[PDB]
């Protein structure tokens, strides 16, 4: 999770399910950031992977889900318009000169 946060993703949740301690099985998950669970923008905005790890007691399942930033290849920066989510891009406001007289060259 710390890696994914340092990777630049704005959210990740991982779940390890099965036997971790004892005869019975626990489903233990950690989630941080944001994560959409519904709608279309879960295919092109969330990456999900399911894997299995064997153990002397049994099999542990690992589910990793990651959010992706806005612009492709991990948020390089704004490019040709391909809008996919809501954003408020606030530019720098115009500034007027304080001096009563205008610029002289």
């Amino acid at each position: 999770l710390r890696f994914i946060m340092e990777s630049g993703a704005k959210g990740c949740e991982v779940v390890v399910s099965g036997k971790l301690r004892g005869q019975r099985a626990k489903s233990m998950k950690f989630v941080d950031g944001l994560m959409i669970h519904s709608g279309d923008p879960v295919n092109y905005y969330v990456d999900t992977a399911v894997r299995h790890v064997l153990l002397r007691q049994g099999v542990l399942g690992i589910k990793v889900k990651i959010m992706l930033p806005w612009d492709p290849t991990g948020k390089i920066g704004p490019k040709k318009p391909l809008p996919d989510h809501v954003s408020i891009v606030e530019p720098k406001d115009e500034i007027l000169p304080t001096t009563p007289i205008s610029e002289q060259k």
């Binding site: 971790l20 301690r21 004892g22 626990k26």
Partner: peptide, 27 residues
């Protein structure tokens, strides 16, 4: 901070080993 006993306790806070794990966590 030791996490092994913390996980063992968090799996079952009132199990057979709850007293020993809680005691080990105290100090």
């Amino acid at each position: 901070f030791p996490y092994e006993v913390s996980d063992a306790l968090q799996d079952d806070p009132k199990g057979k080993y709850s007293k020993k794990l809680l005691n080990k966590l105290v100090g």
